[PDB]
Amino acid sequence: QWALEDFEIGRPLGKGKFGNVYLAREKQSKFILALKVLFKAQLEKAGVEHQLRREVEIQSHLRHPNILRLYGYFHDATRVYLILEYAPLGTVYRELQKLSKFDEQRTATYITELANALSYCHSKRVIHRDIKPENLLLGSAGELKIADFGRRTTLCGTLDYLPPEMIEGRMHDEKVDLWSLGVLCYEFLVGKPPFEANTYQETYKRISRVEFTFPDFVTEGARDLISRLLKHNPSQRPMLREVLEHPWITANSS
Ligand SMILES: CCOC(=O)c1[nH]cc2c1NC1=C(C(=O)CCC1)[C@H]2c1cccc(Oc2nc3ccccc3[nH]2)c1
Secondary structure (H helix, E strand, O other), X not given: OOOHHHEEEEEEEEEOOOEEEEEEEEOOOOEEEEEEEEXXXXXXXXXXXXXXXXXXXXXXXXXXXXXXXXXXXXXXXXXXXXXXXXXXXXXXXXXXXXXXXXXXXXXXXXXXXXXXXXXXXXXXXXOOOXXXXXXXXXXXXXXXXXXXXXXXXXXXXXXXXXXXXHHOOOOOOOHHHHHHHHXXXXXXXXXXXXXXXXXXXXXXXXXXXXXXXXXXXXXXXXXXXXXHHOOOOHHHOOOHHHHHOOHHHHHXXX
C-alpha cells in the first residue's frame, strides 16, 4: 500500500484526460518515477471506472524492459494515483519530428525491442497494441518502451496503422501486430506511414490493395523486411522470432 506522503512531488510532466502527471521520487529509495493523478469526479462523469480497473490490471501484469511499467497505485478521497515508469527521453514521435527520419541502426534496434515486447505480450495473450510513435517512450539509454495504456482514427483504431483484415471486417489475430511493426519500421525509416492518403476512403483502398512505394534511400534489406511484414495474407507475415533473425535486423540492430 502506498500513500502520497511516500513520494516527493516534482514538476508536472504533462496533462491527462482526467488529471496531471508529475515527476516524483519515492522518499526511501530516492527512485525517480512518474505519478499520474486522476480525478474521480472526472472519471465518474465518463463512466470509465470499470475500464480503468481493467487497463490498470493489464499493465500491472506486464513485466518487460520494453513496456512502460506500472509499479502500483493508490487513492484518496478525491483522486486515483498511478505509480508509473519515468521515461526521461520522451516519445519516439518527438524524436522522429526532430530528426524527420531514423537511420538503419536506430530503426533496427527499435524494431528489435518492439519485437521482443510484442513476443512477450503474445505469450501473455495481449494482442493488437497501438505501437504508433506517439505511444512509444524512451528510457535513459534510449531503450524503447511501449506505452499504449490509457492522426486519423476509425472505430477499429488508428487508420494509418490498421491491417487489411480489420478494415475489411474479416477475422484477425496476433498477426495484426506484425502488420503494425511493418508500418512502424517504414515510418521510422521514411518519416511517414506507407498508406497515407487524402481521404479515409483512399487510405482504406491503399491498405486493402497493399499499395505503397519506397523512397530511393530505403535499402534492399529494409525493403525485404517491410514487404514481408506488410503481406495482405496474415499467415504470410513472419513470426516475431523470424523478425529478430532477419539479416537486416542482425546487421543493423545494436
Ligand atoms: C517523458 C516523461 O513522461 C513520462 O515518463 C511519463 N510516464 C508516464 C506518463 C508520462 N508522461 C505523460 C503521461 C500522460 O498520460 C500525459 C502526458 C505525459 C503518462 C502516461 C503516458 C502513457 C502511458 C501511461 O501509462 C499508463 N497511463 C494510464 C492511465 C490509466 C491507467 C493506466 C495507465 N498506464 C501514462
